[PDB]
């Protein structure tokens, strides 16, 4: 007459004795999926308490404890499909799972914090691991299913508390700190035509005293409780790093500089190399402040007394000087940290769409006859699809004036012309350094064109020109390729999924692994990374204009252009070609990001195309899923609501649209983010290779600054790029971001083998993981192919492993997480 059950939970201390969980501490009630009361709701059993510690199980995961329990459940009550749980203890615990035996085995995958019962307005409910579209929900669970969605949505008011599980939207009005200073006021991003932006998770702290449109500061930025990931190992809590760096480590660094205990500036390139060789000497109390901090202490080796040493960046591990080569500068545009901006150039000279009345004549000054195209004429280079560009002219020109008015910031709007050589590598052939020009200008600095040069002061000017380009590129990488296109663009879909797709829903099960830790890292970023005077503003060129620049770019963000084939075709780096395996022909055949990416894209596509038909037999079945239609309607009209008028949104009335939408979401969250994230320290850990800021324009002839370019080119370079103090802070941030936590869940993995009971879904997922293993072998062969050495390894001899699916923990330059997790 009893159902044997096993509860697995983790006491709180395991993620930030066992006998306290016995007695009347924890009650569970089974809920029937087949026998309903007179209202049609599945009947509920009696409160049943944990009976004892099970120590006979083969071996739980670390930190987990198993509890025995027996439910009076006579069979007339039908088959359990859910349960209620009440925690009568003062302290919350993490509920892993319930397992019921000898009844048609029943598994519940919970993985949820359960706070004291008096904190909840309705009792926590958990469903068995079956999957149902809404029309397939067993009738006695239909109302339970919808009431749980209503509970997760909340009502759009109230200050969110730690234990709340309420998902909702708000604008980016929480970055400014106007109550501290008018200088820290920031425009609201989202909800206007001037500043469109993805929505983020609502926190509801309320208004500042000086500005009803800006949300007040808080010690903790709320996320729904189970988004805030605990870790067994403190060192895996990498998301706490940015707060520690901004609030604890940066002031300690600043004091070392204020007290003149270390040189204020780098004076040679070797001063930079020293950081990962002998290290940097700092005051004792500065070391003492840093080396006890979780996560932070993992970033540096130390003698415990005066030395911090950074890890040797991958980009210098074979050749310290290879970053300086034109070969490597161009190669990193297709296999570097930001491999997804280069475009084909199909006319010459390049054109601008900006208004000459505002910025002056926008004609390019690059002349065709000045370029070395390995003997090709311009017409030949254009017609054979060998001309490409890295075009930041129109992106940066609207912000150059305001950036350059800042005291220690000076930039150009840059364009780089690239030629695809017959050997398949890219060659840079010109850089245009543009400045706006209008009648009222007080500056006499002018735009100019710089061409490659290997000797003399011309070689230094060309090296500086490359630095100005990479400052543009690093800013666009950090704020657009990375922050906007992954972190910020994904959060609206996270929110919508939890608000409108039941945990029971097949598309919830398909997508939610790809959201792990995303809202958490994003909230911590709003607090410490992209806030006024936060990490990004105090290390990157645009300073207080950084985040709003990403809103300007979001005006042109197109959901369907995030698909890899559409991206490659839009950028003119591939053409449609049905005769090829992936339906596109690359115009740069050995384009490592794109060629490896197409393999990953195709594997995800096959997986989604196999999973969707398990639950939707026909287009009509997609049309008639009420949760799915509400999910997509809200994702578009609210989550990305500033772009809800755009004609390119899929309608989601067909199987093909459902596949496309899920495929793109998974792609952004896993491989796209990985490709743009985990190369940050490997390439940018040498500040000269990936400068974050430029502080001066090119010097005029006849000046001491010009003579310095002749007599001391390294110092000229270092004075132009990011200063030493923001370099230390920035290196630390990108080292965190390039690190895989040991509890990461990678593409092809899931945190629990029982996420669904449907064997066809589980077998399809196994095929997907096998396919990713085969792809990794293929990518290994690519990196070992000497014919591809030029673009896949370069003179830095750094094999392109960023789209290898698998990785061990640490700073590995490989591995594709499921989600945007750091
Ligand atoms: Fe990231």
XYZ file of N, CA and C in Angstrom, residues 325-333 341-345 347-348 350 364 366 371 373 378 386-394 412-420 426-434 448-452 462-473 690:
201
model
N 53.087 41.124 -36.827
C 53.123 40.889 -38.256
C 51.805 41.270 -38.897
N 51.895 41.769 -40.129
C 50.679 42.012 -40.897
C 49.905 40.725 -41.103
N 50.618 39.602 -41.215
C 49.951 38.318 -41.376
C 49.021 38.039 -40.207
N 49.504 38.247 -38.983
C 48.683 37.934 -37.817
C 47.563 38.935 -37.632
N 47.823 40.219 -37.900
C 46.768 41.234 -37.819
C 45.565 40.860 -38.692
N 45.822 40.457 -39.933
C 44.734 40.083 -40.827
C 44.158 38.726 -40.448
N 45.017 37.774 -40.087
C 44.535 36.441 -39.726
C 43.543 36.498 -38.565
N 43.780 37.371 -37.586
C 42.865 37.375 -36.454
C 41.488 37.901 -36.827
N 41.327 38.501 -38.001
C 39.996 38.917 -38.449
C 39.136 37.742 -38.884
N 33.373 40.162 -38.287
C 33.048 41.511 -38.732
C 33.517 41.801 -40.154
N 34.602 41.148 -40.596
C 35.151 41.367 -41.933
C 34.045 41.147 -42.968
N 34.078 41.946 -44.036
C 33.105 41.862 -45.113
C 33.810 41.818 -46.460
N 33.115 41.280 -47.455
C 33.573 41.437 -48.812
C 33.421 42.874 -49.266
N 34.346 43.305 -50.104
C 34.292 44.632 -50.705
C 34.168 44.453 -52.206
N 33.135 46.961 -54.549
C 33.377 48.150 -55.342
C 34.563 48.879 -54.738
N 35.110 49.819 -55.491
C 36.205 50.612 -54.981
C 36.157 51.994 -55.569
N 35.644 52.311 -51.223
C 34.523 52.028 -50.326
C 33.700 53.282 -50.102
N 36.147 58.188 -49.557
C 37.400 57.572 -49.147
C 38.561 58.198 -49.904
N 41.507 56.488 -50.053
C 42.388 55.404 -50.473
C 42.371 55.355 -51.991
N 47.852 50.509 -53.902
C 47.750 49.273 -53.140
C 48.568 48.165 -53.782
N 48.392 44.558 -54.459
C 47.502 43.402 -54.545
C 48.186 42.229 -55.237
N 42.861 46.370 -59.611
C 41.696 46.491 -58.737
C 40.502 45.750 -59.343
N 38.469 38.826 -54.166
C 39.660 38.802 -53.335
C 39.802 40.043 -52.471
N 38.859 40.976 -52.515
C 38.971 42.203 -51.732
C 37.958 42.179 -50.596
N 38.425 42.499 -49.391
C 37.637 42.454 -48.181
C 37.981 43.698 -47.373
N 37.185 43.949 -46.350
C 37.458 45.092 -45.497
C 36.993 44.816 -44.088
N 37.579 45.567 -43.168
C 37.135 45.636 -41.797
C 36.686 47.083 -41.668
N 35.386 47.306 -41.716
C 34.825 48.639 -41.924
C 34.174 49.157 -40.652
N 34.892 50.033 -39.949
C 34.355 50.717 -38.776
C 34.066 52.187 -39.047
N 34.042 52.598 -40.315
C 33.918 54.013 -40.636
C 32.544 54.544 -40.228
N 31.476 53.903 -40.710
C 30.128 54.385 -40.417
C 29.717 54.066 -38.984
N 40.009 57.275 -34.146
C 39.592 57.502 -35.522
C 38.467 56.538 -35.869
N 37.712 56.838 -36.921
C 36.792 55.856 -37.480
C 37.560 55.153 -38.586
N 37.874 53.878 -38.383
C 38.845 53.221 -39.246
C 38.225 52.288 -40.256
N 38.912 52.168 -41.383
C 38.636 51.159 -42.391
C 39.959 50.499 -42.728
N 39.937 49.179 -42.837
C 41.097 48.391 -43.261
C 40.726 47.625 -44.517
N 41.521 47.775 -45.567
C 41.341 46.985 -46.790
C 42.244 45.766 -46.721
N 41.689 44.587 -47.059
C 42.373 43.303 -47.018
C 42.325 42.686 -48.406
N 43.410 42.034 -48.810
C 43.464 41.310 -50.073
C 43.644 39.837 -49.751
N 42.854 38.991 -50.404
C 42.993 37.548 -50.278
C 44.038 37.074 -51.285
N 45.010 36.285 -45.823
C 44.695 37.692 -45.974
C 45.921 38.566 -45.737
N 46.018 39.619 -46.536
C 47.028 40.633 -46.477
C 46.375 41.988 -46.240
N 46.788 42.758 -45.233
C 46.285 44.135 -45.121
C 47.032 45.039 -46.091
N 46.299 45.853 -46.851
C 46.925 46.702 -47.862
C 46.723 48.191 -47.639
N 45.799 48.615 -46.773
C 45.669 50.028 -46.451
C 44.794 50.182 -45.218
N 45.042 51.254 -44.468
C 44.194 51.639 -43.355
C 43.803 53.097 -43.545
N 42.509 53.391 -43.454
C 42.034 54.763 -43.494
C 41.609 55.172 -42.091
N 42.171 56.286 -41.619
C 41.964 56.812 -40.266
C 41.146 58.085 -40.429
N 39.829 57.979 -40.261
C 38.953 59.102 -40.562
C 38.514 59.850 -39.307
N 43.571 60.531 -42.543
C 44.632 60.154 -43.458
C 44.581 58.672 -43.738
N 45.389 58.294 -44.719
C 45.528 56.926 -45.189
C 46.958 56.509 -44.911
N 47.124 55.330 -44.332
C 48.427 54.783 -43.985
C 48.556 53.458 -44.704
N 49.706 53.238 -45.317
C 49.981 52.039 -46.087
C 51.059 51.211 -45.403
N 51.116 49.912 -45.683
C 52.101 49.053 -45.013
C 53.525 49.549 -45.203
N 52.480 52.922 -39.472
C 51.632 51.799 -39.847
C 51.297 50.934 -38.631
N 52.266 50.710 -37.741
C 51.971 49.948 -36.523
C 50.934 50.663 -35.663
N 51.080 51.978 -35.509
C 50.053 52.749 -34.813
C 48.711 52.686 -35.532
N 48.710 52.773 -36.872
C 47.448 52.662 -37.604
C 46.755 51.340 -37.286
N 47.511 50.236 -37.255
C 46.918 48.960 -36.848
C 46.353 49.044 -35.435
N 47.059 49.704 -34.510
C 46.523 49.851 -33.155
C 45.195 50.606 -33.144
N 45.075 51.688 -33.932
C 43.811 52.425 -33.952
C 42.680 51.544 -34.471
N 42.978 50.719 -35.471
C 42.003 49.754 -35.975
C 41.593 48.766 -34.881
N 42.563 48.185 -34.176
C 42.217 47.169 -33.186
C 41.515 47.795 -31.968
N 41.747 49.081 -31.665
C 40.917 49.722 -30.633
C 39.460 49.778 -31.090
N 39.214 50.192 -32.344
C 37.852 50.102 -32.878
C 37.330 48.673 -32.747
N 38.144 47.703 -33.163
C 37.687 46.319 -33.207
C 37.446 45.767 -31.803
N 45.750 43.546 -28.533
C 44.326 43.893 -28.466
C 44.141 45.078 -27.531
